[PDB]
Amino acid sequence: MQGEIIAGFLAPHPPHLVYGENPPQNEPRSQGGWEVLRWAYERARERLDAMKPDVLLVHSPHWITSVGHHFLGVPELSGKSVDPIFPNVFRYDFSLNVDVELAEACAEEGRKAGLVTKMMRNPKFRVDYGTITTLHLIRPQWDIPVVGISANNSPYYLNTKEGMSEMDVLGKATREAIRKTGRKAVLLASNTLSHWHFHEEPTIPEDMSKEYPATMAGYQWDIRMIELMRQGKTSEVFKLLPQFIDEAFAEVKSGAFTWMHAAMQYPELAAELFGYGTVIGTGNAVMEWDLRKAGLSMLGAADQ
């Protein structure tokens, strides 16, 4: 048996997207909204639907930890996710399943590689809103086991460089765990790009005539950066990441983008852009790196 990284997705977690879909799980009802980013997500949705993965691993910037990198560790987790910033658009009742053995294998490998890792064993833990938003946006059926990873403080407490360096080590430990387990998994980097925004509630939030890039500059970085990606110039986007982080206040500083790619070994592979758009001025790009198609998916023989 071989372990595999079917693909890597840049899966932004804007709560507004689920709000405009009006799913059963979400309490507030909308008049619709953000259909571009939503349609963009319909694409990713079907791609994943075809993939039939064993598990979905997700790195969420809204589960902040100081002592190492944490991994969801209980079989089942449920709750009502209310977005603290956007309570009027996201109050989601969920219940999901965690691939604990893979989750533990990742912690294992991370520690082995020099990182401090922990297993979240409190069954009453409320999975963060970021994680729930992405999982819903990329897989509303909730039929895929998952492995939730915390976003360690390093990039902020220390500095972008040392932080990224840890995300990198996390990523290869993550790849190592996938194969040793023999899992066919998908990777979701729950990050947005330019994060400058509007500091105002637009009355009726779904008014798309009031939705646009917060700053021309931010919009520019976003376009520039994704162009490189769809151009397979992976090494060039990462050399630009630090400047992108600073000038655009891009959410990739949290580390999911670097963790996803480190696990994928920074493929100089062309990425597919399902779509781009803003939300509260924030730039969001829903993209994919199909490793199965590029023949870079298999990791190697599993253990046992």
Partner: protein, 270 residues
């Protein structure tokens, strides 16, 4: 109008595992601060917590009764924090309204399930507040607010209270030096992470006891920066704003570590 003032840690460690000596001592001090609170006979408790984050406009808690069980995203291994927090809707709502008047866009947050932060919860539990007798008026920590605006927000609240003829106990929830250990330790041997943080904590802590507002005022920004104090020490600014930059002195009921970070319980002598 203001009849009491305290500063308490936002960390849940003292509450969750008091059997760990220094944490237990910090917990008992917080409890004592709670008794002093009640002794001052307040009608409302004006609360600001460093962990209640806002990034757009200012938030004020307007739900009458919020209850549930909260698990810390960092300290989950140490237990659960149950709560039944009561708010003074009338006063809170009056603060929502007065906010723009003072140049700050704000809104009320009243949603079943809303994420009351860990600081506000442990404070309510250890201090005995957030009860129907000691309702709360909690004002968010907006990431874009300076210590100055924080003071404006709290003075603005004390204002509304005086209007509604309510005696106010003011409580700032947050830590001191913020250098949390970045690896697992034996809780029993928890300690201030750096001697620099310890010294800086003792230094401003001394100033507070002394009531040396001026010196404290000028040391704050440097301290916050150098000892990585929890959210720029804005929870102290909140205390100051409520007291209009004036207070006779203080009694530090406790000072101990919380996974390397500094934490303390302060009782202010107005």
């Amino acid at each position: 109008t203001v009849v009491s003032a305290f500063l308490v840690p936002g960390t849940p460690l003292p509450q969750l595992k008091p059997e760990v000596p220094s944490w237990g001592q910090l917990a008992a001090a917080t409890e004592r601060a709670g008794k002093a609170l009640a002794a001052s006979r307040p009608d409302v408790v004006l609360v600001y917590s460093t962990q209640w984050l806002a990034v757009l406009d200012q938030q004020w808690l307007t739900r009458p009764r919020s209850e549930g069980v909260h698990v810390d995203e960092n300290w989950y291994e140490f237990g659960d924090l149950a709560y039944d927090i009561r708010a003074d809707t009338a006063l809170a709502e009056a603060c929502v309204t007065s906010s723009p008047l003072h140049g700050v866009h704000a809104r009320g947050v009243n949603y079943d399930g809303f994420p009351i932060d860990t600081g506000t919860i442990t404070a309510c539990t250890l201090m005995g507040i957030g009860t129907d007798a000691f309702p709360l008026v909690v004002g968010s920590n907006n990431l874009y607010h300076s210590g100055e605006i924080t003071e404006k927000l709290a003075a603005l609240a004390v204002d509304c209270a005086k209007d509604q003829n309510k005696r106010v106990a003011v409580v700032g929830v947050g830590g001191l030096s913020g250098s949390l250990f970045r690896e697992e330790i034996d809780p029993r041997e928890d300690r201030i992470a750096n001697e620099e943080d310890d010294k800086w904590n003792r230094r401003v802590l001394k100033l507070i006891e002394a009531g040396d507002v001026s010196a404290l005022r000028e040391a704050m920004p440097v301290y916050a920066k150098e000892a990585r104090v929890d959210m720029g020490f804005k929870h102290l600014h909140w205390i100051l704003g409520a007291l209009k930059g004036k207070f006779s002195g203080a009694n530090v009921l406790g000072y101990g570590p919380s996974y390397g970070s500094g934490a303390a319980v302060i009782e202010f002598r107005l």
